[PDB]
Amino acid sequence: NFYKDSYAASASKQDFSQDPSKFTEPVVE
Amino acid sequence: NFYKDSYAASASKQDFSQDPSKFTEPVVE
Amino acid sequence: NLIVPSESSDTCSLIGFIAAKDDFSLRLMRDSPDIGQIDHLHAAEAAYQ
Amino acid sequence: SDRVLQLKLGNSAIVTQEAANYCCAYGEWPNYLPDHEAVAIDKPTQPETATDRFYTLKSVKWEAGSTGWWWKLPDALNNIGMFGQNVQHHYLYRSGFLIHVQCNATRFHQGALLVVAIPEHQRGAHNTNTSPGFDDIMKGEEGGTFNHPYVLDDGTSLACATIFPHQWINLRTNNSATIVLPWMNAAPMDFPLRHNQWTLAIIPVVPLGTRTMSSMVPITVSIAPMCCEFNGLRHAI
Amino acid sequence: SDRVLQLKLGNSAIVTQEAANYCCAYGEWPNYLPDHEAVAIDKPTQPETATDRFYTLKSVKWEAGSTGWWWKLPDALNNIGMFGQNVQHHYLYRSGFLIHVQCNATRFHQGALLVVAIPEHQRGAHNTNTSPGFDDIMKGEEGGTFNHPYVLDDGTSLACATIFPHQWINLRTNNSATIVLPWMNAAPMDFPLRHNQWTLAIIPVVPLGTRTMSSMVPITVSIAPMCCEFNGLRHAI
Amino acid sequence: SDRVLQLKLGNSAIVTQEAANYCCAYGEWPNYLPDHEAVAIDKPTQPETATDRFYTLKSVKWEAGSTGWWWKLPDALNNIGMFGQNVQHHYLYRSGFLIHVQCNATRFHQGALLVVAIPEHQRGAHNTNTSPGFDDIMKGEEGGTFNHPYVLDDGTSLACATIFPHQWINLRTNNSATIVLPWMNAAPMDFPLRHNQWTLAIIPVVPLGTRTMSSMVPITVSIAPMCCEFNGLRHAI
Amino acid sequence: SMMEINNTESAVGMERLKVDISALTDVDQLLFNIPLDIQLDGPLRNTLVGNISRYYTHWSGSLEMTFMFCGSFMATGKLILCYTPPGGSCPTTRETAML
Amino acid sequence: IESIIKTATDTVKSEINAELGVVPSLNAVETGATSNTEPEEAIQTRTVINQHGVSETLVENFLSRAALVSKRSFEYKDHTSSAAQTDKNFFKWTINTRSFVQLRRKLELFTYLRFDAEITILTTVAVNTYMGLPNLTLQAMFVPTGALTPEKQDSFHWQSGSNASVFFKISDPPARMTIPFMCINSAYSVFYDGFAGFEKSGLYGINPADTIGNLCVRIVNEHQPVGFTVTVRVYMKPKHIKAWAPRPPRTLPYMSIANANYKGKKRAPNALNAIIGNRDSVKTMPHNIV
Amino acid sequence: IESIIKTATDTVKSEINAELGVVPSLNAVETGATSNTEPEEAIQTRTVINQHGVSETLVENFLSRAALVSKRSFEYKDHTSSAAQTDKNFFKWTINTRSFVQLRRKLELFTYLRFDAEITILTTVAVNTYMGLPNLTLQAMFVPTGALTPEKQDSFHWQSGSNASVFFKISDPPARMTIPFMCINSAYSVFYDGFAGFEKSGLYGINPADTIGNLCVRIVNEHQPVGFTVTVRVYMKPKHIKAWAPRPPRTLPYMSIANANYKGKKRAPNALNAIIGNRDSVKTMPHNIV
């Protein structure tokens, strides 16, 4: 990325964090 | 290889391992 | 068998659900068959006016 | 252990004896707006026990040809109590909600309710290309009725509406459902009279049925705002 | 705590929500044949998940003038699944059994079932001195009906049949009964086509009665072989 | 030293006194499927002595105008013994094979057999552009006869078929040939009724000839599955 | 997310999302079956697992079917839910299906 | 609990389980939670080391596809005697993502999106006899919502003192530039349950923060003696994507770009009363192996 | 034993060998093994230091050659009054490697192959008088086996919300992109001794896992007043190649792409009954030095 703006960069395809329990187990206990 | 995928790379022409005996000597002794 | 008394409703219902487990996987992305169009949508010409 | 529940907010309290485990939406709990996310610079009012309390809407009759009911938040509360007075006198609001839905019948009744809280439920109209007007969306305290609940009145699907924070009232199992909603907006605060952020939908997936005597079964909705802030004090409109 | 139960064997599973504490026959659990008790010298096949799994027999209708039902093991399973193929291709078998009997009705029904597993139930015929023939004993999957269940069809007594590994299905209390049977023979292995070792008896000690609507109440039997060995491989007969 | 051989598998054994050194295909020995290569998550059945044993096919008569014989595996064994019952009751199979081919004659006979195991022998038809149908491929236990063995019935060459795991039965030298086949598939397990993975071909490169009395010379094939696993238990089709 | 097992005519809208069972006078009777064909238009297409997978060509892993009984409290019953691996026809009797 | 998942989860071997009080296969759908029953708890499993990567269902990979958002053929000729509604060697486009339904249904799987837009402009030309295809220079000027759009080809709004223009030819590679995340909110509202203004006669469902701006595209060349049909296609690739609150996918066909109105197809599939095409009975198997 | 071979093996000097019990020239073909007789054991040798590299017979170098896999001329014109079987400015191609026989015979030297496909698309154009060659823009959209292929040039499947398209011109260098190893198995089945489905009326020899997908190629331009013949050639280079279980090479000519059916030539060479062309006798030498 020779551009001076950080949004000019290529796609960031390395975000492997998940949390399925905010949709599958949204119960309090 | 500036691409993010490892299959995008050039041809790998440095595999000099052989085993002719799996075709020429397939006998057990 | 489904055994109900006389004051219960004699026809009962099941609801079937399906999910995937965490060993589930998907690959080789393609377009979906579930949507399509043969014409333009309404007011899509108004975006050019 | 997860079937009895008491929800005490303000001077209000709800006990229930046939509950499920309650739902915290997206694993989140309501809070006040922190300083690193604040935008409006004036000091907000936080009328804690005056507004963070249950408000009970009018009960709806649960029948054979019922399609479903919906209330939009905060539009269903913009005229009720000290929450409604703080809404009308201020420009900005921010709150979560604690929705409790009540519906009971006998052990000879059957029926299942999908009680689902939908974020940003932009509705659609059927068989036309004119957008839904102001009176078709802003029903107020009484709420609306689903026209086509099988598609959630927006071309989507009722079958996949369990991706949203939801519970069930299966009359075999429980008689109440509880959803705890956080602040759900792309904005920190919002103008409450022109934007609704949560739609509580209550839908007859299995209809009401029995062969014993036909009493009226109603469905009652108690909604508690949680962690109300208000900015932009002015006159009431 | 002893009323819910899940029995997972092989690719099969049975959940039950109104159970009793299950029965291990004579305090014993099924095992494979150890080396100090082995007789047949060839290496046995142990088709574990293919044969140690529940097999569900045909349900029998539970009526007003019912006398009772019986299935002989392994004769009730000698033609079912991969257990039956291993029986027909081998000379010797050795297995325990996990019998689960299902029968439910409403809370307005009454009736009690003696679900008893009888070891070596040599039957007798009534009012004759000719022994019971082959077709009167080897009923297969369908099983038989008790002629005189008050004497267990062998001159003995139904009243004392609780000396045998048994449970009850009292419709007031439970809707299932579970008996875990070990290998019960004077022999280490046995020829399965000419000798039955356990008879599952299911007997109306208190008959079915209600004054509500008359649905069909069936009784369903699921039998899982446990720790199957097979010796003496040959062709199928 | 490499001419006498005893192959003991299960309750079966084959002695031979004029053998060659036996063939392990591609230098490989059969094994069970390891956990880092497994796909199907249910527990497989491994009916070891019941299925890993020699099965002898029908002998074929070895004549003057013989072109050759072929059996496709596991199709030649899908109806034989407890291997065939495990094939029909399960969805997936995985096994290697130990092929022993028997053919003897006098010291006045001549003739050479190319006994070759061909992986993925997709056949072709002659003088047409229609693909070979189901009955032309799935010959079962009896196997097929080579139409044009000089091209191996697929446009290739018999001369180069020694790139495949093979032996010879030269009647001057030996009277048996033995090939040990591993699992040969791009898949860990496979549906045995619609895919064949090894074709055993037996081909008269030098025809049978003598000037002494003309007895019948047959060729007998004994095939032992090795390290059988089976997944996907269901009913038999 | 809900399967449309009742994808039949005379099932209108939300009647398609539930399966009606009744009392039977014969034993061991088939109630319903579910086509596991996700790509072709069956009961699994309009699911969260069904719609997201139709943006992809290959799939792998286990599925879970959940069935909620929505009768009265007084209603009792026992069912058997059988998954059959491929290769044969769909099993019509309970003997065949429970294997 | 939030964790990092790179491959799908393994399988543990299990044994015969016959324990009282423990019913892993029994669940409570009324709580709103999905079943937690494992394959190890329902059937008897083996150990499987699962090496299947999960990186293609990432929301970055699921959404960073260059999809068509705009398409105009406009006649490139002398326009001194044409109508009032024609494109006289230029067009304007209020930028939306709701005109072409593949990208629309994919973005409407979420309630909120925060992404940078990578815009690719692909111009193609056809002779309106045949004498050759000109290498024409085009100007795509980005006019924000609030500024003045041009009314001519040769108007003086095209000088672009502060508006960002790109000048590109047809024989070149396609023009590509990145539009940032330009919302006044922290995320775009894909769905907006509200009204755009303080009076009650506003538009429903259109948050004004969501609109990027206008994309005014002209041909910088003066006209030739013959006419041409110039088709300009705009392709958007989302990138640096954060997504929130996933939604049910739309089953019915779209009617308009301005709203979520629905008609459905006339018969099943994707009808108003039948989303899945019908079968004969609930115990009828359509693709049954004979 | 597996070892690393970079050059061919050397030769050792040998002497007169007259030893009982040791017959290195006698072998047993009946065992299935190839002869182990060394040149040092058959004739009397010298020491030769052999420096001949073996790197051109590597399976990577033997197979990573860009070979033609597809070739379509299609008329580029106005197609409002043409037939039902014509290519109306677009074509579809079910991707195979079995249409052109140089690459087919080379890949069918193996039973299993695992490789990445490097696809090169070469478009050429001819005027169907002469006025010049247009720089046309083409779209090659990769449609997997399971999705919907377009039925028009201007159909709305070409917007490619998730299908990977490449947009390229004729005046450019050829379009090149890499297709990964896309089999559901661990290797492609070059030969498949089996049937594709569970019913007995499936196709023999065609494993559905082996098929890559479809390659839909259109011209993005609208038609000119004159017509053109556009020929699209597709070239595949295998790379990152693993190969298993080598096979006898095919001697007879191929008949179809769908099967291994054989007719042979009418006379030798490569006939059904005579693969090598005939000579007069077994003691006749054809190219004998006079």
SS3 F201: strand
Q: Are D214 and D108 in contact (CB under 8 A)?
A: no
User: How many Å lie between the alpha carbon of F234 and the closest alpha carbon of chain G?
Assistant: 5
**What is the tally of structural domains in chain D?**
1
How do strand H164-169 and strand H137-144 relate by DSSP bridges?
A: antiparallel
Residue positions counted in chain B: 29
Spatial separation of the C-alpha atoms in residues I135 and H9, rounded to whole Å:
51
CB proximity A20 to D under 8 Å: no
- Cβ count within 10 A of residue I207: 24
How do strand D23-24 and strand D176-181 relate by DSSP bridges?
A: parallel
CB proximity A15 to D under 8 Å: no
Please report, in angstroms and rounded to a whole number, the separation of the first and last CA atoms in chain E.
Answer: 47
CA dist D127 to C43, E103, H270, Å? 15, 52, 14
Spatial separation of the C-alpha atoms in residues F90 and E81, rounded to whole Å:
11
3-state helix, strand, coil in chain B (%, to 5): 25, 10, 65
CB proximity I194 to C under 8 Å: no
Q: Which of H247, H252, H255, H257 to mutate to test the interface with D (most CBs of D within 10 A)?
A: H247
Residue positions counted in chain D: 237
Cβ contact (<8 Å) for F85 and E81? Answer: no
Q: Which residues of I touch C29 (CB under 8 A)?
A: 162
The token pair at F197 is: 């993975």
Q: Which residues of F touch E81 (CB under 8 A)?
A: 89
User: Between I36, I60, I180, which is nearest B13 by CB?
Assistant: I60
Which residues 216-255 on chain H approach chain C with CB closer than 8 angstroms? Answer: 249-251, 253-255
Q: Which residues contact D87 (CB under 8 A, 6 or more apart)?
A: D74, D77, D78, D93, D192, D193, D230
User: Between D21, D72, D119, which is nearest H111 by CB?
Assistant: D119
The letter for the amino acid at D55 is Y
Of I60, I91, I79, I137, nearest in space to I233 by CA: I91
How do strand F176-181 and strand F23-24 relate by DSSP bridges?
A: parallel
The H or E element spanning position H67 is: strand H67-76
Cβ contact (<8 Å) for C32 and I162? Answer: yes
| DSSP single-letter state for residue F101 | E
Q: Which residues of F touch E42 (CB under 8 A)?
A: 11, 49
Q: Are H109 and H246 in contact (CB under 8 A)?
A: yes
Q: Which of E4, E8, E181 to mutate to test the interface with H (most CBs of H within 10 A)?
A: E8
Regarding chains A and F, contact by 3 or more CB pairs under 8 A is answered as no
Backbone angles phi, psi at C35, to 5 degrees: -140, 150
The H or E element spanning position E177 is: strand E176-181
Pure H helices in G1-99: 48-53, 94-97
- Note the resolution in Å, 1 decimal: 2.8
Residue positions counted in chain F: 237
Cβ contact (<8 Å) for G41 and H27? Answer: no
Q: Are H276 and H269 in contact (CB under 8 A)?
A: yes
The letter for the amino acid at E15 is V
Side-chain-side CA neighbours of residue I157 (13 Å): 22
The token pair at I242 is: 């693993």
Interface of G with E (CB under 8 A): 23-25, 27-28, 74, 76-78, 80, 94-95, 98-99
Of I219, I217, I218, I229, nearest in space to I133 by CA: I229
- Cβ count within 10 A of residue C2: 21
Spatial separation of the C-alpha atoms in residues H12 and H44, rounded to whole Å:
10
- Preceding omega of D74 cis (within 30 degrees of 0): yes
CA dist E100 to E25, E118, E169, G77, H176, Å? 13, 15, 11, 16, 70
Chain H: partners with 3+ C-beta pairs within 8 Å: A, C, D, E, F, G, I
Spatial separation of the C-alpha atoms in residues D179 and D19, rounded to whole Å:
12
- Cβ count within 10 A of residue E178: 23
Q: Which residues of C touch G65 (CB under 8 A)?
A: 16-18
User: Between G3, G14, G68, which is nearest D170 by CB?
Assistant: G68
Spatial separation of the C-alpha atoms in residues H216 and H218, rounded to whole Å:
7
Q: Which of G25, G69, G95, G96 to mutate to test the interface with E (most CBs of E within 10 A)?
A: G95
Cβ contact (<8 Å) for H258 and C43? Answer: yes
Of H149, H46, H143, nearest in space to H95 by CA: H143
Spatial separation of the C-alpha atoms in residues H15 and H44, rounded to whole Å:
6
Of D128, D130, D125, nearest in space to D151 by CA: D125
Q: Are E114 and F75 in contact (CB under 8 A)?
A: no
Q: Which residues of G touch D172 (CB under 8 A)?
A: 69-73, 75
CATH of I1-290, one of 3.40.50.720, 3.30.70.580, 3.40.50.2300, 2.60.120.20: 2.60.120.20
CA dist E150 to D161, E143, E171, Å? 58, 18, 21
Spatial separation of the C-alpha atoms in residues H132 and H147, rounded to whole Å:
38
CB proximity E31 to H under 8 Å: no
What strand order describes the sheet that includes F198-209? F144-145, F69-73, F198-209, F110-119, F166-170
DSSP collapsed to 3 states, E96-108: EEEEEEECCCCCC
Spatial separation of the C-alpha atoms in residues E90 and E192, rounded to whole Å:
9
Pure H helices in chain B: 21-24
Q: Which residues contact H264 (CB under 8 A, 6 or more apart)?
A: D151, H252, H253, H270, H271, H272, H273
The token pair at D28 is: 């989140």
Q: Are B16 and I6 in contact (CB under 8 A)?
A: yes
Place of tokens 């497994």: F38
Spatial separation of the C-alpha atoms in residues H47 and F37, rounded to whole Å:
10
Spatial separation of the C-alpha atoms in residues I79 and H44, rounded to whole Å:
61
Spatial separation of the C-alpha atoms in residues E223 and D114, rounded to whole Å:
39
C3: nearest CA in chain G? G76
Spatial separation of the C-alpha atoms in residues H62 and G38, rounded to whole Å:
20
Q: Which of E85, E86, E88 to mutate to test the interface with F (most CBs of F within 10 A)?
A: E85
Each residue of I227-244: b (16+ CB within 10 Å) or e?
Answer: ebebebbbbbbbbbbebb
Q: What is the CATH number of the domain that holds E153?
A: 2.60.120.20
Containing domain of residue D135, as a range? 1-237
The letter for the amino acid at I19 is E
The H or E element spanning position E87 is: helix E81-89
F237: nearest CA in chain I? I198
β partners of residue A23? none
D107: nearest CA in chain C? C8
User: Between I30, I190, I273, which is nearest F174 by CB?
Assistant: I30
Spatial separation of the C-alpha atoms in residues D85 and I4, rounded to whole Å:
85
The letter for the amino acid at I166 is V
Of D99, A27, F9, I7, nearest in space to H27 by CA: A27
CB proximity B1 to I under 8 Å: no
DSSP collapsed to 3 states, H195-242: ECCCCCCCCECCCHHHCCEEEEEEECCCCCCCCEEEEEEEEEEEEEEE
User: Between F41, F233, F235, which is nearest G88 by CB?
Assistant: F235
Q: Are H129 and H227 in contact (CB under 8 A)?
A: no
Spatial separation of the C-alpha atoms in residues H239 and H60, rounded to whole Å:
7
User: Between C30, C37, C38, which is nearest I146 by CB?
Assistant: C30
The token pair at H241 is: 């994507």
Q: Where are the domains of chain H?
A: 1-290
H40: nearest CA in chain G? G62
CB proximity E215 to C under 8 Å: yes
DSSP collapsed to 3 states, chain D: CCCCEEEEECCEEEEECCCCCCEEHHHCCCCCCCCCCCCCCCCCECCHHHHCCCEECCCEEECCCCCCEEEEECHHHCCCHHHHHHHHHEEEEEEEEEEEEECCCCCCCEEEEEEEEEECCCCCCECCCCCCCHHHHCCCCCCEECCCHHHCCCCCCCCCHHHCCEEEEECCCCCEEEEEECCCCCCCCECCCCECCEEEEEEEEEEEECCCCCCCEEEEEEEEEEEEEEEEECCCC
Q: Are E218 and E66 in contact (CB under 8 A)?
A: no
User: Between H68, H133, H174, which is nearest I134 by CB?
Assistant: H133
Place of tokens 């009705």: E105
CA dist G35 to E228, G72, G99, H51, Å? 34, 28, 18, 28
Chain G: partners with 3+ C-beta pairs within 8 Å: C, D, E, F, H, I
Regarding chains B and I, contact by 3 or more CB pairs under 8 A is answered as yes
Cβ contact (<8 Å) for I225 and H73? Answer: no
Q: Are H157 and H90 in contact (CB under 8 A)?
A: no
**Residues F160, F166, F170, F173, Cα dihedral to 10°:** 130
Backbone angles phi, psi at F87, to 5 degrees: -70, -45
Q: Are H252 and H264 in contact (CB under 8 A)?
A: yes
CB proximity H263 to G under 8 Å: no
Q: Are I167 and I220 in contact (CB under 8 A)?
A: yes
**Residues F224, F218, F125, I104, Cα dihedral to 10°:** 50
Backbone angles phi, psi at F170, to 5 degrees: -95, 120
CB proximity C13 to H under 8 Å: no
Handedness of CA I197, I198, I202, I207 (dihedral sign): positive
Of D1, I108, C23, nearest in space to G64 by CA: C23
Cβ contact (<8 Å) for G55 and I162? Answer: yes
Side-chain-side CA neighbours of residue A22 (13 Å): 16
- Cβ count within 10 A of residue F177: 28
Q: Which of I38, I52, I57, I58 to mutate to test the interface with B (most CBs of B within 10 A)?
A: I58
The token pair at I48 is: 């030769």
User: Between G62, G86, G91, which is nearest F91 by CB?
Assistant: G86
User: Between E10, E48, E233, which is nearest F50 by CB?
Assistant: E233
